[PDB]
Design a protein around this ligand. Structure first.
Ligand code: HEC
Length: 82
């Protein structure tokens, strides 16, 4: 299983992309930002289920989508992109 396949199996790519910006953060850009900053993961996945705060865009992402597992996976892919 891959988080890139799971990232496209839901609706992340609706505005994410693994290399472009639109509504949500570019996953690859997240890699080019955080890069070696793993101190959350729980509240990072909480963003995937409660909307962001506003770093690249002032429009938080649609909160709620799953539980807190299928997201936890795509939550470490962001922090762990390359
Ligand atoms: C558009 C309809 C989105 C969908 C569908 C998903 N995301 Fe998203 N995401 C979106 C926005 C508007 C934002 C915040 C705006 C800003 O630039 O800050 C985000 C951001 C994230 C983040 C955290 C980014 C951070 O600052 O490091 C993550 C980890 C994230 N989004 C996860 C994620 C996943 C896993 C999705 C599918 C399950 C997904 N997003 C969909 C917009 C949208």
């Amino acid at each position: 299983e891959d988080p890139e396949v799971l990232f496209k199996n839901k609706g992340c790519v609706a505005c994410h992309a693994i290399d472009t910006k639109m509504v949500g953060p570019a996953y690859k850009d997240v890699a080019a930002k955080f890069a070696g900053q793993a101190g959350a993961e729980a509240e990072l996945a909480q963003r995937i289920k409660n909307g962001s705060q506003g770093v690249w865009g002032p429009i938080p992402m649609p909160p709620n989508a799953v539980s807190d597992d299928e997201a936890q996976t795509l939550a470490k892919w962001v922090l762990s992109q390359k």
